[PDB]
Amino acid sequence: MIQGVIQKIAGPAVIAKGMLGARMYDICKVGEEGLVGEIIRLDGDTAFVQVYEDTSGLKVGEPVVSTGLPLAVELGPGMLNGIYDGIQRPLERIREKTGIYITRGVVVHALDREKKWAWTPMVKPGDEVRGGMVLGTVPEFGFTHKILVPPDVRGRVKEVKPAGEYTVEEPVVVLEDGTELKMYHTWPVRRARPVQRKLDPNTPFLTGMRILDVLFPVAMGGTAAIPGPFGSGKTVTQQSLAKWSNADVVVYVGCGERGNEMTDVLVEFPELTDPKTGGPLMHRTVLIANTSNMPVAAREASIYVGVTIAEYFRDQGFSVALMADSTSRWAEALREISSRLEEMPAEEGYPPYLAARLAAFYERAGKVITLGGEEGAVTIVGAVSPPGGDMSEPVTQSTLRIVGAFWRLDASLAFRRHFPAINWNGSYSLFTSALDPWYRENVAEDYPELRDAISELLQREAGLQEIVQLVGPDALQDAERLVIEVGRIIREDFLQQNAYHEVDAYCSMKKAYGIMKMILAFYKEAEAAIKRGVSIDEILQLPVLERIGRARYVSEEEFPAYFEEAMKEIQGAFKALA
Amino acid sequence: PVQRKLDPNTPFLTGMRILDVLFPVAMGGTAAIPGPFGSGKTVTQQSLAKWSNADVVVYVGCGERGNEMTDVLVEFPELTDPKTGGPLMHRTVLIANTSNMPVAAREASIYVGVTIAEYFRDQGFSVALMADSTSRWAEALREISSRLEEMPAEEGYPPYLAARLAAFYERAGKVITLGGEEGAVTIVGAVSP
Amino acid sequence: PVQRKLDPNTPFLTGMRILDVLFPVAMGGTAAIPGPFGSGKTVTQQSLAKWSNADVVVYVGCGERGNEMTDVLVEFPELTDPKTGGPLMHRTVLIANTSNMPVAAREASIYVGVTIAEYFRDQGFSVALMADSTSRWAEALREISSRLEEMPAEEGYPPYLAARLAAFYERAGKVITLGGEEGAVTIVGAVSP
Amino acid sequence: LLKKEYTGITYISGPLLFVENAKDLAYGAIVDIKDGTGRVRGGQVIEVSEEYAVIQVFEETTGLDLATTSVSLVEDVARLGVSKEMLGRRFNGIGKPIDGLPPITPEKRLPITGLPLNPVARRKPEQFIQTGISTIDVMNTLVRGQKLPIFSGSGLPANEIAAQIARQATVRPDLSGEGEKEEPFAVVFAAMGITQRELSYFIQEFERTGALSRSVLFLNKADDPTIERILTPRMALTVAEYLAFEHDYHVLVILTDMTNYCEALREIGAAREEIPGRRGYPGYMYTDLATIYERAGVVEGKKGSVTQIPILSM
Amino acid sequence: KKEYTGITYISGPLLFVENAKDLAYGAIVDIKDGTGRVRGGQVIEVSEEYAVIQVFEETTGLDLATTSVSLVEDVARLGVSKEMLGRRFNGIGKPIDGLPPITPEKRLPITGLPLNPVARRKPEQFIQTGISTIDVMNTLVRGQKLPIFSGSGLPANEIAAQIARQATVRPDLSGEGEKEEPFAVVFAAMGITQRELSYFIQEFERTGALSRSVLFLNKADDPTIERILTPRMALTVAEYLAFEHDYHVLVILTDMTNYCEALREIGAAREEIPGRRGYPGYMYTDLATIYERAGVVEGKKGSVTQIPILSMPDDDRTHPIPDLTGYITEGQIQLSRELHRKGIYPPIDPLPSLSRLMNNGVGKGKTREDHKQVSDQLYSAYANGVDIRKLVAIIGEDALTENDRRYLQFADAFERFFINQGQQNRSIEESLQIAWALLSMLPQGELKRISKDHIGKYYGQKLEEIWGAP
Amino acid sequence: PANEIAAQIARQATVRPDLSGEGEKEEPFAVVFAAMGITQRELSYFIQEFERTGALSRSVLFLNKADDPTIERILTPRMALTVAEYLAFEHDYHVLVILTDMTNYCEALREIGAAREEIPGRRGYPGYMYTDLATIYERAGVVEGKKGSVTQIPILSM
Amino acid sequence: RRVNALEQVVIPGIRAQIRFIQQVLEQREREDTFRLKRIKGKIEAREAEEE
Ligand SMILES: Nc1ncnc2c1ncn2[C@@H]1O[C@H](COP(=O)(O)OP(=O)(O)O)[C@@H](O)[C@H]1O
Ligand SMILES: Nc1ncnc2c1ncn2[C@@H]1O[C@H](COP(=O)(O)OP(=O)(O)O)[C@@H](O)[C@H]1O
C-alpha cells in the first residue's frame, strides 16, 4: 500500500508527503507509534491526515502507512455478548492485555481469531451463488448464525470445506474465479446495506410499558423519539426497553455518556435474565459504550457502527431493536468535528448538514425483504436532551420531521413523581390504524373500540380544568365529579407504572386489557347509580376502588382469577346500592 | 444640468384621500412606502399612475412579477387619460426587468428610468417616477460586491449602499431648465423589508 | 521589588456614604467602577481625589477630555489638604493624555503612573491611584493590532489583553518596603463599556 | 461522437476538485467522474480559468485519488429528454425511472433551467378551477395560471390536502359558456425530502382512485444525495412547460415541501464559503426561488396553462 | 546539549527557529539570551524548515543575533512521591514554601491515559463534608463529580476551604466498624490573587490541615500556560496516590472559568477559529479529559472524588461553561445570592441543587436508614413553604389556614437553623437530629413520604436542643 | 425638526453682561457652517433662514451636497474648524460652529475603512472611529489670555 | 381579568422579543466568524509570497 513520511505536525493535523495514490477518507497509521487517522484533503504529492489520538511526542520523518480502506466493521460470528467502543474495539480483551488504562496504539481484533466454530455447509460444488445468499450455519448460543456471501460477490462454487471445527479466518467456500469466502466480511459504516423491497409494518413492537404500547404504539420497523428535560426518565425507559422488549436482538448504543452512569449498564446487565428464554440477558445484546473522554472521532461514528450491525442481523431474518441514548451528545461531537474543519455554522453552532445526517440515520429502519428472501426489521428508538427543556432546539426540530412516533416527557409530572412522565397531550403516534387489524385477532375483538373510550375519558377531564382551577371539586355536580374521579383512577392506576418494582416493571397486553375493562365497567355502573339518584360520597367509599388500585401489583399468572373476581364483585356491589 | 432648483409649492394630487389630506407630497418631493408582502404597495403605485395629475408617468419594474407588467400592458390602453381625453398608455413609459431576468440588469433599469424622467423634465413637463422596489437593486449590488470579494458592512450589503440611494433620490425636484422653462420630477420608491 | 506582602486590615476612607458603608475597600485593595456615559465616573473619582485620606494622589487621564484636566489644574490650588492644612495640589501628580493626543501614548501613561505610585510607596506613604478610563487602553491595543495583521480575539481585541490588565492590578497592595517601612498602593479603575 | 478525458487532478478537498489542463470546459457544463474502481460520479463545472477549472461533485468524494481519477465531459448544458408517453410513469428526481418499466424514448431534449417568458407574450389569467374545497373555491378562488402556496405547520395535515386536491381537481367548461366538451388535464407531482411512510401513502393514494393514468411523478427520498433535491423541481417544471405549451394541456404542478429544498440549498451554498444571509441561508435565495415560481402562467395565442401549488411548513 | 541559534522571527509570544526538525511536538525548551536569563517555552508546531515556540513570560530583551534555544524534555513530566503531602507548588511543580525539593519516586506524564470503562465499579460509600445541606440532601459519594455553581460576590473560597478542612470518612458507620482509611486532599487554584493566596495559606496552616494536603497555587499574573497545566498535575498526583497507595483523595479545583478563559487566549494565540460565543470548538472534549479522571476501580481500594468550582458570568446557566459542565458531571450545588444578602452562611439553595448518585451512598448499612425519606420530606415541605411566604405579603397571615401557618413557620425556622450553620462542624447524626427536630413542628400524619416505623421512632424531639445550644 | 432648533438657537443666542456683572457688551457671533451630504430641501431652508436674519455677512459656509462625491466629507469638518480656530484665536472673534450631519461623516469613514479592511468595532465601523471623531470635537474651548472662543453644535440622527 | 391578561398578552410579547434578540446576536456571531476566516486566509497567503 501507499507509504510516506511526516512533513508537518500541528495539533492533530498532520501533513504527509510521498502519499501520491492515497484515496479520500482512508484510514492511515501515523508514525511508529501506530496512531490512526483519516485523510481529509489531497494536494499534489501531499495528504492531510487528521490523527484521532494525542500526537505529543511525534517527530518529523516518521512513516505514514495507509490501509487502503475507509471506516469499516467486521461482520461475522462472535458479536453477541460483546462490549465495543465507537470504532469496534473490544474493551474486554483490551483490559486483559493492558490493565486499567487504555494505552495509545493498542492493536486488537473485533472478532476473536482463535475460537473454533462448528461449520455446517448448505451448498455443494457447482452451485450458482448470488450476493446475500446463505453458505451455511454456525451455532451461537440460542441462535443459529447464518454465513452470508457478501452483497457484491457472485459466481460459481468450486469447493466446500467439510463439517468440523474452524476459526473465522479459515476460507470455507472458494469460488471458481479464485475468490475465497471466509466466515466474516467487512462493510463500510457509511454505506446502507441493500435489500430487495421494503414493506409496510403491520405487527406491534411490544415495550412492556402500559402507556407506550396502548396509547402511542410503535410498529415493528418504525421509528420513535423520546425527548425530555434533565431527570425526566429517558435513561430508565431506554434500559426498560432493553430489558423487557420482544425483539430477538437488542443493540444498545451509548454515543458519549457519563462514566459513572455507563458503569451501571456495564455492571448490572450480566446479572439479569432473558425474558423469553430465561438465559443470560447479554446473550442477545450487543453493547457499544463510549465515555466523554474517548476520542471525538469514535463518538461521532458510534451510531453508524450500531446501525450497521443491526442491519447485518436484519439480513439473517431476525428482528432487531436499536436504542440510541442521548443523540444530543452525538450532535455535540458532530459540531466539534465541524468546528475543527472550519465550517460556517447554522442555527446555534450546528453545521448546516445536521438534518441530512439525522435523516440518513433514521431512514435505515423498516421491515424489508432480505436478499435471501427472508423478512427482517430494524426498530430505532432515540433519546434527545434539549439544553433547556425547550422543543425549539434544532436537533428536536430535525428529529420530529422524520420519526413515526413522538413520546414527550414533561418536567411538571416528574416534579410530582408521576412516572413515566409522558405528556399524553403533546404525544402522538402514526401506527395505530395499521396495527388495528393485529390487535383484534390477538388481544380481543373489542380492543380498538375500547381504547378510544379511555382516550375520550381522558379528553373530557382536560376540558374541566378551567372550572376546577376556579372552583373547588366539591362544588361540581355529580355528572362531572364522576368523570373527575374516573380520570384520577385512570391516571393513578393505569398510566402510572413503577420500573423498580418486582411485578409492575413488565405488563402483558391482556393484563392491560383487563384493567381497562374493569375501569370502564366501574364508570358505567357509577353513571347508572348516579342516574338513580344516589350521592357520589357513597360511591367513592366502595371497597372495589382499592381492588382496581391493586391490579398493578398482582402477578402475571394470578391475574386471570383476580380479574374474574373483580368483575363479579363490582356488579355485586353496585347492584346492592340504593 | 439645470439652471436653478426651486422650492416646491404645489401639491402632487394622487387621488387617495388619506395621502392627499393627511400626508401630502409636493410637486418636487420624494416619498417612500415601506411595507411587508400583501400590504398594497403595487396597488397604490398603479393607482398613482392611473389617477395622478402628472403629464408623463415613468414606471420601473425593478425585480418584480411579470403578471403585473402584463396587467399594465393589457388594461391601460382601455383607460382614459384624466387631463387629455386620449388613451392612458399614450403618457406612459414602462421599464420592466422581472425577477427571473438577469440580476445585473436590475441596477441599470433604475438609472435608465431616472434619466428618461429627467429628459422629459427638460421639455417643460411634470413627470412622476414610480420605482416598484429598491430592495431588489440593493440585492443586485450585494451580489456584485460578493463576486468582487469586498468586505460587507451590515447584513452583507456593501458599505457604499447609502451613497447610491442618496444620489438616486437627489435627481428629483422642481427646476428651471436650461431653456428657461419650468419642470419637475417626483420620485415614489417602494421598500420591501 | 518588595520584601513581604501584608494583609488588608485598614479601610480606605473615600468620604461617600454608600462606598464607605455598604461597599468598603481596604487600604491595599482594588476597585472597579463601570458605567455608561454621563453616569458619574469622573465626578466620583475627582471627589475621591479631593476628600480621601491618602498621603499622595496620582491621577491618570488616559484618553479623556482636556477640560477636566484644566478643571483639576485650576480648582485644586485653592483647596485645603484634609490632613496637612496646605494646598491640595501639593500632594497630587497628574499624568494627562487627552483623546486628540497620539494613540500609542495611551499605553505608556498607565505604566508611568503605576511606576510613580510604586516609587512613592517605597518611602512609607499610602498612595491612591485613579485611572480615568482603562477601556481606551484596550481600544489603543486594538488599533495597533490592526497594523500588525494579527488574528484578533472576541470584539477585535488582541488575545493578550487579559494578561496586561491582570499584571496592572497586581501591583496594588500593602507591602513591607526594602527599607523596612510600611506602605500601600490602592487602585481605582473606571471602565467604559 | 468522440469523447475527451482530463486526468490532471491537482487538488481534492470537501466537495470540490481542481482539473489543471481543462481549458476547453464550458462554464456550467456537466461532467462525469470515474475513479479506480469504475464507479462513476456526476459533477458540475462552477468556475473556469486559464490555470484550472473548479468542479463540485454531486455526492461523496470518498474513494477518489489523484493518480487514477479521470474527468470526462458529458454535455455543455443540462438537458432532459421529454416525451408524451411519460404520463403514468415515475422517476427518481434525476430523470431515471424507478417503476421498473423500460426508459422512455425522447422526442426532444430541453434545458432544465428554462428561459424567461417575455412579458409581452403573457396574458391575464381569467378561468377558475374547481378544487372541490368550499373554503378555497368560494373565498380564495384559484385561477388557471396562478401560483398559490399553502402555509402549513409541523403537525397539520398538508399532505392529505395535497392528495385531496390532486384527486379531486377538475376544470369545468360548461360553466364558462364554451360548452360541455373534453379538456386535456394533467397533474405533475414533485415530492422532495419525503420519508418512506409518506412515499407509500402517496403511491397508494394515487393508485387507489386511478388518477395515476394522467399523472407524472418525480419522487425524491430523504436519504438521497442533496443535489437531486435541487434538480427535482426543475425537471417537473420542464415537463409541465413542454406539455402545456406544445400539446396544449392544462397541467397542475404540486411541490410537496419547499422547506427541504431551502435546507438543501443552504447546505450546498455554505460549502463554497460564501457570505450568508438572514439566518444562514444564502443571499441569493430570492433569485433562486424566483427561477422556479415564475415559470407558471398563460401565454397569448396558446391554449395550455401551467398552475403551481407549492406547499411549505413554517 | 545541542543549541539552536537560527532565530528568524519574534512577535508577541511566538518565535521561529530554523533547522530545528529534531524537536518533538509538544516538547519543553528553554530560551537563553545575551544577559544570561533563561526563560521557558513549548513547541507548538514542527515543520521541515522551522519550528514554532510559545514562550512563557514576556519577550523583553530578546534579539535575532544572540538568542539560542536548547531542549529540556521530550514531553512534560512530573516527579511524584509520598513526601509531597504538606507541600506547596507553583503550578509546574516548583516548590514555593522554601523547603528542599522532593526526591522523585517516579516521573509521570501529566496527560494521563483514559480509564477503561469495563474496569470501573459503582460508587457506594459517602463522604461526610460537615455541612448539613450537603450531607443530608445532596450527599457526596466517593467517586462522584459534583460541581459548585457560584457567582461574582458569593463566598465560594470560604466554602472550598471549609470543605477541605472538615472532610472525613466514617468507617464506623459502614459494616461492622471497618478499618483504617487513609485520606488526603489535593487543592488546585487557577488564577487566584494575592488576597486569596494569603487567605488559603493562613487557613490551611492554622489548624493542621496542611499535614494531609498538597497545594498547587497559581497566581493571576503567572503565565497562562501555567494555568493550563495546573489541574492536570493535581490530577496526576491524585491518581498516583489513589491507585498506587490506596488513598481516598479529594480534589478541589477552585475556578474553572479562569481555566476556560486561559484556554480561549491560548487558542486565539495559535490562529484557531472559535466556536459558540468565541470559545474554542474543542472545549467539551478538553473539559471531559479533566472531569472523567475521577472514579473508583475494581480491584483497587482507593478512590478519586472531584468538586469543581465555577462562577457563572452573569448568573446565566445557559452560558457554555456551565452548560457543558452539566453534560459531564453528576449533579450540581447552587449558591444563592438572596440567602447571602440575608446573612446566611453557607448560602446553599436546596431547590435547584441535585445529586445524581445519592441513592447508592445513603441507606441501611452505610448510614442511618431514614436518610432518603427525611431528605424527600424536607425538600417537599420547604418547597411548599416558600410560596406561602410570598402569599402572606398580599393576603395577610390571619387569612391563611392552619397548615399554611405551620408551613410558613417551618420555612422560616429551616433557613434560621438548618442552613445557617456558620463555621460549625456537624456530623451526619447531628444533622439528622436537627432535621428530625424541625419536622416535629409539622403535625404528625402530614409526613406522607416517611414510613410509620421511622415516625414512631424519631418524631417528637424538641427544637430546643439546638435553639438553647446554638 | 433639528434644523429649526439649530436655526432658532443661532438666531436668539446672546450673553447677558448685566447679570454676570462684566458690563462688557459683545459683537454678534460669527457662524461657521459646514454641511455634509445635505439635501436641497434642508439647504434651501438654511439659506433663507440666514438671509432673513442678516447673518450671511458674518458667516462662512462649506457645502458638500448629497449628489457630491462621498470621500470629500473627510476634509470638510477639518477645513471649517481650521477657519474657526484661526478667526477665534487670531482676531478675537466669538465663533459658533454648526455641523449638519455627523452620520454622513461616519458613513464616509466606514466606506474607506472597509475598503482597506481594518479591524471593525460594533456594526462594522472601523476601530479607530473614536480617535477620528476626537480630533474634530476637541478643537473647541477657550484659551487663557485670549478673548475669542469656539462653540460647537453638531447635529446627528440616531 | 388580570390573570387572563397576564396569561394571554404579556408573556408572548416578552417571548417574541427574546426570540428576536437571540437571532440578531447569532447573526452578528456568524458575521464575526466570516471576518476571522478572511483574516486567516489573507495571513496564510502573505507568508507564501515567495515559496
Ligand atoms: N418508570 C420509573 N419508575 C420509577 N422511577 C423512575 C421512573 N422513571 C424515572 N424515574 C426516576 O426519575 C429519575 C430520572 O433519572 P434518569 O432517567 O436516569 O435520567 P434522565 O431522565 O435525565 O435520563 C430516576 O432517578 C428515577 O428514580
Ligand atoms: N386600495 C386597495 N383597495 C382594495 N384592495 C387593495 C388595495 N390595496 C391593496 N389591496 C389588496 O392587496 C393585494 C395585493 O397587494 P400588493 O399591492 O400586491 O402588495 P405587495 O406589492 O406588497 O405584494 C391585492 O390583491 C388587493 O386586493
Ligand SMILES: Nc1ncnc2c1ncn2[C@@H]1O[C@H](COP(=O)(O)OP(=O)(O)O)[C@@H](O)[C@H]1O
Ligand atoms: N455626586 C454627584 N453629585 C451631583 N452631580 C453629579 C454627581 N455625579 C455625577 N453628577 C453629574 O453627572 C454628570 C456626569 O459627568 P461625568 O461623571 O463627567 O460623566 P462620565 O460618568 O460619563 O465620565 C456630571 O455632569 C455631573 O453634573
Ligand SMILES: [Mg+2]
Ligand atoms: Mg408588489
Ligand SMILES: [Mg+2]
Ligand atoms: Mg468622564
